[PDB]
Design a protein around this ligand. Structure first.
Ligand SMILES: [Ca+2]
Lengths: 372, 298, 53
């Protein structure tokens, strides 16, 4: 079994107060408490980041909804916080109790996703770099749960933030998912005692750091023997009816009296009128997914742009997800850039999640796409 | 004459320990079922019969574990030993031997019983149940074949002989047939006649930093899979096991064992299942192979 | 380590063709471990995650 530390809810209405007198004399934030009970986590399905599934585990002590569960491992993870600076960090799996049944089986939600809950973010914040969004999302003054610090690899979140659809107000969950897909990284919450020996506080931090500051791409093979589960995910939201029966309203009748114009999307990506086609069908799709679209003529009176129709019939990012057993010959840990060979086909992406169960040790591989 | 059952801790391995369950102190008796159950997925429409795919299912073998020991101390020492020895290794290979064949089955301990109904000098009479990993496979030695030059015959072979400046005659049927080939010692074939499922090869490399290992070709001369490694120094030998349960890809230099899995070419190694054709040696001076091939009923 | 001599804590020892296993895509910190109670073999080598001196 694994060891588990059970604490009461890390209420930021209590812990965010900077009244604690440090040994030197300085006034700082309130440190994390001691576990109300030391128990042992048993009959477990424990994820590392909580990318797809929520963790579930039975616990010896009678835990209740709200309590924080810190699962301990007798091993250490070295995170590169600065180019040369590597810090000794202890392996932890921190969750929030969402629901306990009659048989004391607790439904555990990964601390980070349970922290950025109900938080909404406007398009104005998303206009800047990915660092600005992370600095907004991780704040104990706003979040439902207490936060002390954030470790983040500057190179991975250096790039310009992904463009938002309709420039609307999105939830912290949807933006994080959209950002974490492009950066090819996943967050891990860790409880560890303050770095300075003078500070006696136990603190909770969020991890956006890796074993290598400048991440390198790995090349590996996944055999059918590892109980492989193949399923297709969609990163970007784009429409599914590749053929469009487009109708344009007549100005004189203020009605759709005029016949429709059919538009087909080629295999390359371009959108053409169906009547204009002069080919052999090799450059057109294998299956015709169709929809009927209605458009209103602009103030100028001109028909709607080809490009505007194109966006609605354009293809979505078909991405392959692979869930398999941990290979001891070539171990794959979370937040690693990999190139997986499966049944003669090459899939490129990252390790998003990791399940620590009683029977097996499994990985969630997410193909980042961007192949041609 | 009579059949032989032998439990092996690790077959194909240096740390092997064999227990004779036919002649030794601890014996297996009256196997429950050595046959097979098949599910053919047959559906009948209006009296006409349609057959799907046959899933050959293997059933648990339940033996009659019986120890013969001089004292109560001896038989308790036999039960503690035999069971721990099966438990120590993740799976144990049971050898089935008769006048006609020598098959093997990969087994996993399903259930073992210990009761206080002792016979004479405290002798056990219990039931030992096993789960089937792979039922009946042949563990045999795979070797290459050599090609030799045909003899030179006057009038039959292409030579300019007899009266000067030589002569070779075109006849009907006998005419001219080439004797052989210059340097026929280059041709070697590692023939694969039936589909094999796993193997234990001992590869001795030639040149360092040049990919060394094996490649497999089909009946038309096309590569389908290849286990090849690019090491920095010349390994004394690369010990490879394709067995699914304990896959091993290790290189040896002196007394030091190195894991060669990350150095391997992952693109070339497409499958484990070897098909009918031939095998080639990439940058190898010598190779020793042991091939294991399945049989459903024996 | 084909031939590498190390003086750790004033104790001299030679590494003669001593091979140490490594972690894939990681920064391995090779340590010299001395345990005087292990009278047969006091020096042992280990590739670790961080500098645990
Ligand atoms: Ca073996």
């Amino acid at each position: 079994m694994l060891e588990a530390n059970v604490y009461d809810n890390f209420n930021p209405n209590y812990y965010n107060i900077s009244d604690f007198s440090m040994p030197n004399g300085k006034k700082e934030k309130r440190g994390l408490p001691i576990p109300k009970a030391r128990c042992q986590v048993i009959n477990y399905e424990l994820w590392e980041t909580g990318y797809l599934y929520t963790s579930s585990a039975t616990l010896t002590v009678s835990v209740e909804v709200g309590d924080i569960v810190q699962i301990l491992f007798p091993e250490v993870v070295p995170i590169e916080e600065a180019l040369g600076k590597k810090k000794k960090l202890n392996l932890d799996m921190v969750y929030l109790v969402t629901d306990v049944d009659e048989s004391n089986k607790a439904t555990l939600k990964n601390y980070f996703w349970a922290m950025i809950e109900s938080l909404d973010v406007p398009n104005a914040i998303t206009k800047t770099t990915n660092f600005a969004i992370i600095d907004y999302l991780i704040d104990p003054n706003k979040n439902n749960l207490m936060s002390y610090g954030y470790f983040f690899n500057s190179s991975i979140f250096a790039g310009k933030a992904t463009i938002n659809r309709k420039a609307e107000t999105s939830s912290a969950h949807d933006v994080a998912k959209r950002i974490f897909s492009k950066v090819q990284f996943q967050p891990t919450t860790t409880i560890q005692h303050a770095p300075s020996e003078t500070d006696p506080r136990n603190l909770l931090f969020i991890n956006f750091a890796s074993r290598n500051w400048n991440r390198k791409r790995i090349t590996t093979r996944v055999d059918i023997k590892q109980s492989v589960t193949m399923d297709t995910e969609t990163i970007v939201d784009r429409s599914a009816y590749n053929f469009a029966v487009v109708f344009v309203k007549n100005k004189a009748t203020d009605d759709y009296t005029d016949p429709p114009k059919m538009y087909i999307a080629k295999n390359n990506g371009d959108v053409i009128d169906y009547s204009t086609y002069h080919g052999d069908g090799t450059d057109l799709p294998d299956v015709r997914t169709a929809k009927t679209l209605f458009y209103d003529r602009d103030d100028h009176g001109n028909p709607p742009e080809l490009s505007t129709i194109k966006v609605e019939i354009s293809p979505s990012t078909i991405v392959t997800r692979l869930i398999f057993n941990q290979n001891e010959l070539l171990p794959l840990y979370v937040n690693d850039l990999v190139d997986i060979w499966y049944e003669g086909k090459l899939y490129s992406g990252y390790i998003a999640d990791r399940v620590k169960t009683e029977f097996n040790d499994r990985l969630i591989f997410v193909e980042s796409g961007d192949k041609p | 004459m009579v059949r032989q059952y032998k439990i092996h801790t690790n077959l194909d391995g240096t740390d092997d320990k064999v227990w004779d369950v036919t002649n030794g102190k601890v014996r297996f008796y009256q196997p429950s079922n050595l046959g097979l159950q098949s599910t053919n997925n047959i559906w009948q429409s209006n009296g006409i019969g349609v057959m799907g795919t046959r899933s050959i299912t293997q059933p648990q073998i339940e033996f009659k574990l019986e120890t013969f020991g001089e004292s109560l101390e001896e038989n308790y020492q036999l039960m503690k030993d035999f069971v721990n020895d099966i438990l120590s290794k993740k799976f144990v290979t049971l050898e089935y031997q008769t006048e006609i064949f020598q098959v093997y089955a990969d087994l996993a301990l399903a259930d073992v019983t210990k009761t206080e109904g002792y016979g004479k000098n405290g002798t056990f009479s219990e039931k030992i149940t096993f789960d089937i990993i792979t039922k009946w496979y042949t563990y045999e030695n795979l070797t290459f074949d050599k090609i030799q030059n045909g003899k030179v015959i006057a009038g039959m072979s292409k030579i300019y002989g007899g009266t000067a400046p030589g002569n070779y005659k075109y006849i009907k049927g006998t005419s001219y047939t080439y004797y052989g080939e210059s340097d026929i010692d280059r041709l070697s074939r590692w023939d694969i006649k039936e589909e094999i499922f796993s193997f234990m090869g001992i590869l001795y490399p030639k040149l360092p930093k040049t990919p060394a290992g094996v490649r497999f070709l089909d009946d038309i001369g096309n590569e389908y899979t290849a286990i090849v490694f690019k090491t920095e120094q010349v390994q004394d030998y690369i010990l490879i096991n394709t067995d699914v349960n304990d896959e091993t890809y290790q290189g040896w230099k002196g007394t030091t064992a190195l894991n060669l899995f990350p150095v391997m070419d992952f693109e070339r190694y497409r499958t484990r299942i070897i098909e009918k054709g031939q095998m080639e040696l990439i940058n190898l001076s010598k190779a020793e192979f042991k091939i294991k091939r399945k049989a459903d009923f024996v | 380590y084909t031939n590498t001599s190390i003086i750790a804590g004033g104790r001299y020892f030679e590494l003669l063709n001593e091979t140490v296993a490594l972690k894939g895509d990681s920064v391995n910190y090779i340590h010299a471990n001395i345990d005087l109670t292990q009278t047969a073999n006091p020096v042992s080598l280990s590739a670790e995650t961080a500098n645990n001196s």
